[PDB]
């Protein structure tokens with residue numbers, strides 16, 4: 561099952577929600593990662609884009625702990641094994657908790673896209689994608705928290721969208737993974753957020769997308785606009 565087993569922030573490792581272990585316990589370890597029930601298929605497809613499952617994945621509940629991270633520094637996400645067939649983008653978001661992330665109602669979170677990578681090279685379909693880069697980087701993805709971002713408590717939502725079946729309506733498969741973070745330092749900037757259940761439609765061009773035919777039209781990364789300044 562492809563999921564995030566842990567992250568590195570401020571040079572410090574935080575173990576994630578081990579979906580292969582923790583669900584099988586009454587009292588799993590505390591983690592900054594949200595708990596999920598995604599022990600079966602492992603994804604949320606287009607039929608679930610307006611369900612609460614798209615927010616933090618299936619039946620997700622708040623993580624108990626929070627990780628500090630300096631604005632302007634990097635977070636590394638460590639993925640477990642990713643199938644080569646599962647080509648697609650990697651997208652990362654922040655939603656402010658305006659309060660404690662351990663108790664925030666996830667249906668109220670409004671996410672800002674802070675990082676996104678798409679089709680890297682489509683010369684030879686199905687091409688080389690963000691997820692391919694992640695695999696080549698020892699199954700790790702890295703993002704930078706914007707240096708200008710306002711200090712505060714945020715849910716960090718990191719997602720792969722696998723496109724191997726995405727020419728089918730509702731065929732794109734989304735793998736969101738959420739973490740509680742506290743951004744320190746920083747500036748006063750914040751993006752305008754989008755509700756989790758408003759991030760994607762099954763008819764979006766980067767959602768209903770054929771990776772196998774000529775890619776001379778590029779790939780339009782889905783979701784709301786990337787934060788800049």
Ligand SMILES: [Mg+2]
Nearest residue numbers: 598600601602
């Ligand atoms: Mg599942």
